[PDB]
Amino acid sequence: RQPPEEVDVLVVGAGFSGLYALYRLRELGRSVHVIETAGDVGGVWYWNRYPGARCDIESIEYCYSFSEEVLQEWNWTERYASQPEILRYINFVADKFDLRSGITFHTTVTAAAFDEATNTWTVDTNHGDRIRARYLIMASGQLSVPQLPFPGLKDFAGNLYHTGNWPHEPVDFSGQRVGVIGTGSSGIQVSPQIAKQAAELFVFQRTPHFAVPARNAPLDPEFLADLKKRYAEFREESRNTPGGTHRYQGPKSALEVSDEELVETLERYWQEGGPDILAAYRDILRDRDANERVAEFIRNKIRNTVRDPEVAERLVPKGYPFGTKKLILEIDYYEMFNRDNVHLVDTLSAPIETITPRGVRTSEREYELDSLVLATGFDALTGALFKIDIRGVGNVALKEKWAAGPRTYLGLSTAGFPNLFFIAGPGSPSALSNMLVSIEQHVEWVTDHIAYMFKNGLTRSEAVLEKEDEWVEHVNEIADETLYPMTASWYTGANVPGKPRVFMLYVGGFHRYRQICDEVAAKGYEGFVLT
Ligand SMILES: Cc1cc2nc3c(=O)[nH]c(=O)nc-3n(C[C@H](O)[C@H](O)[C@H](O)COP(=O)(O)OP(=O)(O)OC[C@H]3O[C@@H](n4cnc5c(N)ncnc54)[C@H](O)[C@@H]3O)c2cc1C
Ligand SMILES: NC(=O)c1ccc[n+]([C@@H]2O[C@H](COP(=O)([O-])OP(=O)(O)OC[C@H]3O[C@@H](n4cnc5c(N)ncnc54)[C@H](OP(=O)(O)O)[C@@H]3O)[C@@H](O)[C@H]2O)c1
């Protein structure tokens, strides 16, 4: 295509966030355009084409709600949508609303500066494009910059993959000795798929993550047709929860119940499948003794599923509270370790020294491999922004304002960078809820804000320093009543060497955050200085 020279709003990213922003700003009567590195729309579901890639929120929850047409027409097929289906869904939405005409593909934003003279952003690309825009909306994702973990890497003679940059043609592992590094949810999803083709699968686990069974199933078309009659009502229920989904909020303490009640209640969640067990009790994420009561139950289920108790014990998560890393939904992951051709390489015990040209050496031995898959995650939440040279007032780099951790007012803007907005990022609920609920709310609040600026004749919107300071403090304070900050997770930035350890997300629940945001808007955007 080709980016316009001037535009009311420039949006970066064509995944869920950017698509909705483009749609809604058009509907608001604004000129808007999108720059996207990828060859086409989808964002994470464009990039994460590893086999077994699948959402952990139910298909009926994980979808747009802005368009009645879309809710009535689209049919989901399974409890949880695999990546191809979600990508087909996003394509369907792009077509329906003709979004591709406002998007330049194959183009990476590399810099952006705020010009105080004009109250506009100047944005440059890796193609030479230079765009002038009143407002800049960063919809560049939360888990969109692959993290490659390092000594022997470029030496590897075989094929090298990262799950977050998977080839667009399916990949044949038939006959191969294959290694996976990462047992986060990417590796836990990709591994049983690989184990079916490979002669030998080596799973390189470091800290074992908690996974519970997904128990995927066909989605009954009769249930779907029924749900469609009440869909807006149903999504509205989802928006009035902490997590953006129909999870039941267990009112009891995990400490108050008897042993027999605990086992029974949790057994029920384990048979049902899904992530809801995370809210079986109100204090699982607040109190270390409540947490441990749940964690031990799960731990015993793991020892149950694997026949060799030596391998079994190696898969049991230790050292950190259940649910403080992302909780993972597994499909046949544990059962896979009972196969003859799958070997758990415990690297807490025998750390990876180096990659060789033949494979991977740990302290203990060398494993030869034809293919190596990195399921090693992402430079989360800040990674995409930090890959861009972004400059605010007095030429402050964002990289510098945020060097000790991200600093925002509501997660939506940062002081000294006016007219710039982050969609579903640090300082807001983000990945702690159903992201379609997080993303829709932010797109609507930001684009309402833009509309309100234009109608009132204003051209400059900035967060007030002391409000940002109060916001950061409040985020840290509420985070500090949970067990989240106790643990090294991507939420904490802890998977990136050198990255400052700070819990980056709002933990007070989607619903409360949204109230705070509405109260702000209704007061003429309190905490913002508009001129
Ligand atoms: C594999 C995977 C599975 C997921 N499963 C769940 C799920 O179970 N539940 C859920 O709630 N969330 C899920 N997510 C989280 C996911 O981030 C959100 O649900 C949502 O897809 C993100 O939407 P987005 O548009 O904000 O970001 P993205 O989908 O990441 O889109 C951002 C786009 O911007 C592009 N971009 C970045 N920087 C630049 C730049 N410099 N110039 C041009 N383009 C740029 C990126 O290439 C990307 O295409 C999962 C994430 C991953 C990685
Ligand atoms: N179905 C889904 O919902 C789904 C699927 C995929 C992704 N996601 C989203 O994206 C996030 C990322 O998931 P992910 O699995 O890609 O990444 P991750 O959760 O960031 O897991 C990275 C994995 O790689 C390991 N690792 C990283 N660096 C390493 C190193 N230098 N040496 C050895 N091991 C290393 C980590 O070990 P340690 O744990 O010990 O650090 C962990 O096993 C998820 O938590 C979730 O938010 C969701």
Side-chain angles (χ1 to χ4, degrees), residues 2-149 151-168 170-306 308-334 336-531:
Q2 266 275 339
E5 317 213 305
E6 295 174 8
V7 76
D8 279 342
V9 186
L10 184 64
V11 175
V12 188
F16 282 121
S17 291
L19 298 183
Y20 188 30
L22 172 63
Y23 165 90
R24 211 181 183 261
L25 280 165
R26 291 178 161 177
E27 285 305 295
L28 284 167
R30 304 265 58 113
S31 37
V32 46
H33 194 87
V34 183
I35 316 301
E36 161 69 44
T37 290
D40 202 347
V41 307
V44 320
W45 312 101
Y46 179 94
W47 299 102
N48 293 82
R49 303 200 185 189
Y50 64 88
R54 193 182 287 290
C55 191
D56 272 6
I57 300 309
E58 297 184 338
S59 321
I60 61 181
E61 308 276 11
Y62 192 68
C63 54
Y64 284 127
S65 75
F66 74 82
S67 165
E68 184 68 22
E69 287 214 345
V70 177
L71 292 159
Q72 300 307 317
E73 293 166 38
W74 188 260
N75 306 311
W76 294 101
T77 55
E78 314 176 45
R79 183 169 182 203
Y80 319 95
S82 72
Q83 168 276 324
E85 188 175 21
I86 288 162
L87 185 54
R88 281 198 290 292
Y89 175 84
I90 296 170
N91 279 327
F92 173 84
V93 178
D95 299 327
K96 183 173 220 80
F97 300 114
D98 178 35
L99 303 171
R100 279 188 197 86
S101 63
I103 308 172
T104 307
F105 296 98
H106 291 285
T107 305
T108 301
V109 177
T110 47
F114 183 74
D115 171 63
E116 188 74 71
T118 44
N119 280 170
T120 77
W121 282 89
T122 289
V123 175
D124 296 347
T125 85
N126 71 334
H127 285 276
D129 310 313
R130 164 155 296 175
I131 302 110
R132 183 167 288 93
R134 174 95 68 232
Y135 297 100
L136 184 49
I137 294 184
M138 301 298 295
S140 23
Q142 304 71 223
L143 294 152
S144 56
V145 179
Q147 177 69 198
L148 320 342
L153 204 61
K154 68 227 324 275
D155 299 335
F156 192 54
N159 309 97
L160 184 76
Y161 311 91
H162 197 287
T163 56
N165 191 41
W166 197 261
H168 290 5
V171 173
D172 184 11
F173 292 109
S174 282
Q176 313 196 10
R177 304 173 70 77
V178 194
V180 186
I181 301 153
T183 48
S185 83
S186 290
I188 275 178
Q189 293 192 321
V190 83
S191 275
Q193 297 313 128
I194 298 173
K196 290 163 169 199
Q197 289 196 316
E200 306 279 352
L201 177 58
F202 290 98
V203 178
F204 296 92
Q205 166 189 263
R206 202 220 247 151
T207 327
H209 299 220
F210 287 89
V212 305
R215 310 222 195 260
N216 197 25
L219 193 71
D220 184 39
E222 160 147 18
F223 172 86
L224 190 65
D226 257 317
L227 171 66
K228 281 155 167 197
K229 290 136 162 288
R230 63 179 311 255
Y231 220 148
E233 180 190 351
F234 173 91
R235 209 96 152 21
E236 186 161 53
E237 303 168 324
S238 296
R239 301 190 193 112
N240 283 269
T241 58
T245 80
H246 281 72
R247 189 175 322 196
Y248 166 88
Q249 294 280 309
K252 297 208 211 200
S253 177
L255 288 169
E256 91 192 62
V257 296
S258 66
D259 288 347
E260 166 192 307
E261 179 168 351
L262 190 90
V263 157
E264 269 180 61
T265 288
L266 296 178
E267 197 69 46
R268 181 192 267 78
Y269 276 100
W270 187 265
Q271 299 312 313
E272 191 187 41
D276 290 359
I277 192 180
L278 244 192
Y281 298 99
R282 65 181 201 249
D283 53 345
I284 288 166
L285 292 172
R286 309 198 137 247
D287 170 289
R288 203 175 293 106
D289 293 301
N291 188 278
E292 185 67 3
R293 261 196 131 187
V294 173
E296 205 49 40
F297 178 82
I298 298 174
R299 285 180 186 123
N300 288 317
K301 289 300 206 187
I302 296 167
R303 296 156 181 147
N304 178 195
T305 308
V306 183
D308 181 350
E310 138 111 328
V311 170
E313 200 63 31
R314 216 170 281 292
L315 290 154
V316 169
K318 273 149 173 153
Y320 70 98
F322 161 81
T324 56
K325 289 174 169 278
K326 193 253 175 158
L327 177 56
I328 305 169
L329 305 180
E330 65 94 32
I331 303 173
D332 300 325
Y333 168 77
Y334 292 122
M336 159 183 84
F337 289 100
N338 301 306
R339 295 237 311 272
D340 281 325
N341 81 311
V342 184
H343 326 276
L344 187 64
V345 182
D346 171 359
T347 69
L348 269 198
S349 177
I352 287 161
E353 248 200 51
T354 186
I355 297 316
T356 66
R358 298 202 135 106
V360 176
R361 193 204 319 296
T362 68
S363 41
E364 275 165 8
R365 64 163 274 200
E366 199 207 3
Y367 300 82
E368 334 194 351
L369 314 164
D370 311 293
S371 279
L372 184 67
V373 184
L374 303 185
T376 51
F378 296 82
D379 177 358
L381 294 158
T382 48
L385 294 162
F386 283 8
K387 283 217 308 132
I388 308 166
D389 183 28
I390 299 170
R391 307 255 149 206
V393 193
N395 192 234
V396 185
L398 185 64
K399 257 189 81 184
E400 154 167 309
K401 200 177 150 174
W402 284 17
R407 304 189 63 89
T408 59
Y409 179 43
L410 310 168
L412 279 155
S413 274
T414 186
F417 295 68
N419 291 10
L420 167 61
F421 306 96
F422 315 101
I423 306 300
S428 78
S430 200
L432 297 180
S433 85
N434 173 10
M435 298 217 57
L436 255 298
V437 165
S438 292
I439 287 183
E440 285 192 337
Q441 192 258 339
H442 264 191
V443 172
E444 285 151 29
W445 187 107
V446 168
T447 62
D448 276 0
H449 180 65
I450 291 167
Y452 177 99
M453 291 287 289
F454 278 94
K455 149 207 161 78
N456 286 295
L458 304 158
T459 65
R460 189 180 200 276
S461 173
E462 185 183 15
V464 174
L465 184 57
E466 303 81 56
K467 302 296 291 166
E468 165 174 279
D469 294 326
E470 178 196 22
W471 183 256
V472 174
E473 236 263 271
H474 174 57
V475 161
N476 294 343
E477 201 177 309
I478 65 168
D480 281 344
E481 297 157 9
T482 77
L483 318 183
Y484 277 119
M486 283 176 82
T487 121
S489 58
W490 64 262
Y491 294 144
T492 260
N495 58 146
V496 186
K499 196 164 154 185
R501 299 321 178 67
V502 199
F503 194 79
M504 297 177 259
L505 301 188
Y506 178 83
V507 295
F510 169 77
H511 185 357
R512 177 159 49 208
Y513 174 81
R514 189 228 56 239
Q515 285 183 126
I516 283 174
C517 286
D518 285 333
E519 249 136 46
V520 164
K523 285 173 151 97
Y525 300 93
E526 170 185 297
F528 278 80
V529 52
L530 321 165
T531 56

